[PDB]
Amino acid sequence: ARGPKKHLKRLAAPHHWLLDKLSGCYAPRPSAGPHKLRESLPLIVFLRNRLKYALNGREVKAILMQRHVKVDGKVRTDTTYPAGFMDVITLDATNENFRLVYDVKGRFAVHRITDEEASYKLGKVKKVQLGKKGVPYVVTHDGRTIRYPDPNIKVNDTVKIDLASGKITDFIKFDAGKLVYVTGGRNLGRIGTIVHKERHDGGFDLVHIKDSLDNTFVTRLNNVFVIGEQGKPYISLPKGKGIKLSIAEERDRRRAQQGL
Amino acid sequence: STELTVQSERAFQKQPHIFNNPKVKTSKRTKRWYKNAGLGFKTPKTAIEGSYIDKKCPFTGLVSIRGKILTGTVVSTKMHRTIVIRRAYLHYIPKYNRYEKRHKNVPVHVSPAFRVQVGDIVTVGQCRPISKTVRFNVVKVSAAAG
Amino acid sequence: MKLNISYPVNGSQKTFEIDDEHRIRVFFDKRIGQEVDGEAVGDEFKGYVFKISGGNDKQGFPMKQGVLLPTRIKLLLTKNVSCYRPRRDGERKRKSVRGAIVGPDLAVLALVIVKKGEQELEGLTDTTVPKRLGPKRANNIRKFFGLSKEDDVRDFVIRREVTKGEKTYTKAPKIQRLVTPQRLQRKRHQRALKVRNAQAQREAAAEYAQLLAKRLSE
RNA sequence: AUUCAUAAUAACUUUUCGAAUCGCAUGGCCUUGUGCUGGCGAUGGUUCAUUCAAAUUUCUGCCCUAUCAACUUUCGAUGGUAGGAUAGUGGCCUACCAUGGUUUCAACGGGUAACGGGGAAUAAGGGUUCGAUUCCGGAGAGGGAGCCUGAGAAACGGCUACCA
RNA sequence: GAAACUGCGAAUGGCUCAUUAAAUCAGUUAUCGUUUAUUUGAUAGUUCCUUUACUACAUGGUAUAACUGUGGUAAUUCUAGA
């Protein structure tokens, strides 16, 4: 139909934004950006549904226009900015540093960290390729391309990249027995290990995941994301630690913690 | 199940960017390029030693094999470089809880390193559509009962 | 008809309404661009060699250039050609038009003096109007005053005077393309950024080559 | 899975791109010329990448109809070679060369008060009817074709032609 | 801070359901079969000249709107001459 959609109604955005059905037709429709509009979250729903620092889009626009919100270190005045996975949205005013990591349930929640670890974001690589003047380069999943890598890096390896240097720091070579953060499907937002790895050559190779609490599952491989060493993750983790309790014991934990 | 000469039509059938240098004495009698099809499949020995061209072949050729991989028997062979498959299968019905027998047809590009005829259960993968019906290139063959 | 006559050298223009058919009919069989003398329409116009410029018919539908076979006609028009300013960019339109060869119902013709004769006309010979807005590019000012390369064209610009109700003050055009210390610092910064980014990529390549030698050392 | 990324050679090209730009600050120097350096951020500018996309495309799946049993080919019907076209594959079109392709497991033709899907109603279970309509996908701007502009439209709150 | 020149967008939204019955469409595929403004991130040291009597880089050209004035036609978001 003649060209690109710029509207997007409510009941069509992802569900991890947790928008109410009413008080509009529309839903804040990410611009083009680093992160996909299924896996990102705009700053406006971040600020006014998840942090409650405004009540109006008027307000969120003035807030961003005051040049405090340094999403990956850079001031953003764009309401429709797609803040997505492993994002280091920091401030100066409240001096707080939010990292967009998920829930156990699959929802971009709040994760308030220090200034240390507000200075590096991780990233899965998704193609490594050779370019002009014989220069190799490596992609991430925000689209950060980086020239001159460590050649030890392959595809599906993760990288710690700082904020402003680029300058690829401690990467992780991908293999078995590593802590990963599965970020898709129903296994979205659970943490486990690389107990087994399988190649179905030609279509959609997979990886067995065992968590800590003896729950095997088996994910696809564009949902894998290495967060590091065995019991040693390079960043901090939310409550639950990506473990996905059953619903009855979930209710039992809620009821027991309900009251003293 | 016929074949032809070396060059037939009004062009000179070769592969692109393959240059049998006339100045250097070619000890071998050609520079025959090919590739490996992948998906575990094996290039036939006839393909490497052969003397066809067929730019639509997965072997010594310019298209590539990806997408769905399938099998089926062969019901027609009377085209030039294409056969006609009949993927026989059963269709369920929820209401009657009972299957019903059904079929389609999906004509594939028989390459002249593959000797086929009626019978011949074949295996065949998807290859960037070639003409209006044919999206599939035969990669492996087998006989019918004997 | 009605005839507008224009003299650019003094910059003026005026309409007359001559009706003497024996005078008017000498301009027939003439397209736009030709030159005449108006001794038929007036002995006051004797020696004044003209050049016909254009005009409108008895319905206002104008003329153009190369618009021959002169009855009123329709034509598909585009940008950059007259009789139509495009109201949405890219759009073309089919507007009517009239032929340039002078016929009888050309209700307004307008023309220019290209060669002055001998007589006097009250509003186009002695009455002069200068230009309204002066030169504003630096080289236009230099050619307007015949200025050299380093003649400091800043303070030789056309100053215009206005009073508000009493408070008199001058104003001047803001000269664009002036070589400024602004542009000096800008060219300096841009060239320095270029050469420094080049040297940084060179040194990064060198460090990467050292790292690859260390990897190949195994 | 590659003739893939890339790299090099030999050249070619109406030789594409390589900031004649702007706003704040006004800082460091000595060989004071009123000289030399100098930040913050605004648009652009080439390719690659990402994103928003779009177009094709694999598979499988549709209501009634035999008072529709054969259909397809001048003028492409199926397939090849090669060229043009195109964003790009492709009978998409053209030359040439073969008669193919579909079908009683229902083709082709007819109806429809046929947009489809998400779903709705009624509900023991198995189902039956409906879905123009709050979302996705489609399609159209009176009927029908053509085309400028533009990354994107066969745009109609654009144009041109005819018809009503 | 009017008017215009420029760059952008007016292709999104909105409406209806007439057509179309393997067509669309839903799942499930591919781009090793291609375009893509935008946003994000990378990225650019070479342009002329037998490389000595060079040929603006403290920087090169006219060519148009808004404006000024003379006008048309009963009449258009019509426009012409200067």
From Swiss-Prot, chain A:
Q: What else is known?
A: Present with 573 molecules/cell in log phase SD medium.
Q: What name does this protein carry? A: Small ribosomal subunit protein eS4A
Q: Belongs to which family?
A: Belongs to the eukaryotic ribosomal protein eS4 family.
Give the sites of the cross-link named Glycyl lysine isopeptide (Lys-Gly) (interchain with G-Cter in ubiquitin).
61, 133, 160, 167, 173, 178, 210, 232
Ribosomal protein as a keyword of this entry, yes or no, is yes
Name of the gene encoding the protein in the UniProt record: RPS4A
User: What is the protein's known function?
Assistant: Component of the ribosome, a large ribonucleoprotein complex responsible for the synthesis of proteins in the cell. The small ribosomal subunit (SSU) binds messenger RNAs (mRNAs) and translates the encoded message by selecting cognate aminoacyl-transfer RNA (tRNA) molecules. The large subunit (LSU) contains the ribosomal catalytic site termed the peptidyl transferase center (PTC), which catalyzes the formation of peptide bonds, thereby polymerizing the amino acids delivered by tRNAs into a polypeptide chain.
**Which residues does this entry mark as bearing Phosphoserine?**
31, 246
**SUPFAM superfamilies this protein is in?**
Alpha-L RNA-binding motif
Q: Which GO terms describe its cellular component?
A: 90S preribosome; cytoplasm; cytosol; cytosolic small ribosomal subunit
Complex formation = Component of the small ribosomal subunit (SSU). Mature yeast ribosomes consist of a small (40S) and a large (60S) subunit. The 40S small subunit contains 1 molecule of ribosomal RNA (18S rRNA) and 33 different proteins (encoded by 57 genes). The large 60S subunit contains 3 rRNA molecules (25S, 5.8S and 5S rRNA) and 46 different proteins (encoded by 81 genes).
Query: Chief subcellular site?
Result: cytoplasm
An example of a Gene Ontology BP annotation on this entry? translation
GO MF annotation list: RNA binding; rRNA binding; structural constituent of ribosome
**Top-level taxon:** Eukaryota
User: By its UniProt entry, which Gene3D superfamilies does this protein fall under?
Assistant: 2.30.30.30, 2.40.50.740, RNA-binding S4 domain (3.10.290.10)
Domain S4 RNA-binding, which positions? 41-104
The record ties this protein, via InterPro entries, to: KOW, Rib_uL2_dom2, Ribosomal_eS4, Ribosomal_eS4_C, Ribosomal_eS4_central_region, Ribosomal_eS4_central_sf, Ribosomal_eS4_KOW, Ribosomal_eS4_N
Keywords from UniProt, A to Z, are:
Cytoplasm, Isopeptide bond, Phosphoprotein, Ribonucleoprotein, Ribosomal protein, RNA-binding, rRNA-binding, Ubl conjugation
Q: Which residue positions does Phosphothreonine occur at?
A: 114
Name where it's found: Cytoplasm
Swiss-Prot record, chain B:
Q: Which Pfam families does this UniProt record tie to the protein? A: Ribosomal_S17, Ribosomal_S17_N
GO MF, any single term: rRNA binding
Q: What is its main location?
A: cytoplasm
Cite the InterPro entries for this sequence: NA-bd_OB-fold (IPR012340), Ribosomal_uS17 (IPR000266), Ribosomal_uS17_arc/euk (IPR028333), Ribosomal_uS17_CS (IPR019979), Ribosomal_uS17_N (IPR032440)
Entry's localization field: Cytoplasm
Output the Gene3D superfamilies linked to this UniProt entry.
2.40.50.1000
Question: Record keywords: Iron included?
Answer: no
Q: Which residues carry this modification: N-acetylserine?
A: 1
Q: What does the entry give for GO biological process? A: maturation of SSU-rRNA from tricistronic rRNA transcript (SSU-rRNA, 5.8S rRNA, LSU-rRNA); ribosomal small subunit assembly; translation
Of the GO CC terms on this record, one is: cytosolic small ribosomal subunit
Q: Where is this cross-link: Glycyl lysine isopeptide (Lys-Gly) (interchain with G-Cter in ubiquitin)?
A: 14, 45, 55-56, 78, 95, 104, 132, 140
Looking up SUPFAM superfamilies in the UniProt record yields:
Nucleic acid-binding proteins
Q: How is it modified after translation?
A: N-terminally acetylated by acetyltransferase NatA.
Q: Which UniProt keywords apply?
A: Acetylation, Cytoplasm, Isopeptide bond, Ribonucleoprotein, Ribosomal protein, RNA-binding, rRNA-binding, Ubl conjugation
- Source organism, top-level taxon: Eukaryota
Described function? Component of the ribosome, a large ribonucleoprotein complex responsible for the synthesis of proteins in the cell. The small ribosomal subunit (SSU) binds messenger RNAs (mRNAs) and translates the encoded message by selecting cognate aminoacyl-transfer RNA (tRNA) molecules. The large subunit (LSU) contains the ribosomal catalytic site termed the peptidyl transferase center (PTC), which catalyzes the formation of peptide bonds, thereby polymerizing the amino acids delivered by tRNAs into a polypeptide chain.
Q: Which family does it belong to?
A: Belongs to the universal ribosomal protein uS17 family.
> Beyond the main fields, what else does the record say?
There are 2 genes for uS17 in yeast.
Describe its partners and assembly state: Component of the small ribosomal subunit (SSU). Mature yeast ribosomes consist of a small (40S) and a large (60S) subunit. The 40S small subunit contains 1 molecule of ribosomal RNA (18S rRNA) and 33 different proteins (encoded by 57 genes). The large 60S subunit contains 3 rRNA molecules (25S, 5.8S and 5S rRNA) and 46 different proteins (encoded by 81 genes).
User: Can you say what this protein is called?
Assistant: Small ribosomal subunit protein uS17A
Q: Encoded by which gene?
A: RPS11A
Swiss-Prot record, chain C:
Xref: Pfam families: Ribosomal_S6e
Question: Which function does this protein serve?
Answer: Component of the ribosome, a large ribonucleoprotein complex responsible for the synthesis of proteins in the cell. The small ribosomal subunit (SSU) binds messenger RNAs (mRNAs) and translates the encoded message by selecting cognate aminoacyl-transfer RNA (tRNA) molecules. The large subunit (LSU) contains the ribosomal catalytic site termed the peptidyl transferase center (PTC), which catalyzes the formation of peptide bonds, thereby polymerizing the amino acids delivered by tRNAs into a polypeptide chain.
Further comment: Present with 66000 molecules/cell in log phase SD medium. There are 2 genes for eS6 in yeast.
Report the Gene3D superfamilies cross-referenced here. Answer: 1.20.5.2650
Gene expressing this chain: RPS6A
Per the record, residues carrying Phosphothreonine are 163
What keywords is this UniProt entry annotated with? Cytoplasm, Isopeptide bond, Nucleus, Phosphoprotein, Ribonucleoprotein, Ribosomal protein, Ribosome biogenesis, rRNA processing, Ubl conjugation
Family from the record: Belongs to the eukaryotic ribosomal protein eS6 family.
Q: Name one GO cellular component term.
A: nucleolus
Q: Which top-level group of life is the source organism from?
A: Eukaryota
Molecular function terms in GO for this entry? Answer: structural constituent of ribosome
Q: Which GO biological process annotations does it have? A: maturation of SSU-rRNA from tricistronic rRNA transcript (SSU-rRNA, 5.8S rRNA, LSU-rRNA); translation
Alphabetical list of InterPro entries matching this protein: Ribosomal_eS6, Ribosomal_eS6-like, Ribosomal_eS6_CS
* Oligomer status and interactors: Component of the small ribosomal subunit (SSU). Mature yeast ribosomes consist of a small (40S) and a large (60S) subunit. The 40S small subunit contains 1 molecule of ribosomal RNA (18S rRNA) and 33 different proteins (encoded by 57 genes). The large 60S subunit contains 3 rRNA molecules (25S, 5.8S and 5S rRNA) and 46 different proteins (encoded by 81 genes). Interacts with snoRNA U3. uS11 interacts with MPP10. Component of the ribosomal small subunit (SSU) processome composed of at least 40 protein subunits and snoRNA U3.
Which residues does UniProt assign to the signal peptide?
none
Compartments in which it is found: Cytoplasm; Nucleus, Nucleolus
Q: Supply the name of the protein.
A: Small ribosomal subunit protein eS6A
Crosslink Glycyl lysine isopeptide (Lys-Gly) (interchain with G-Cter in ubiquitin): position given as 116, 131, 149, 214
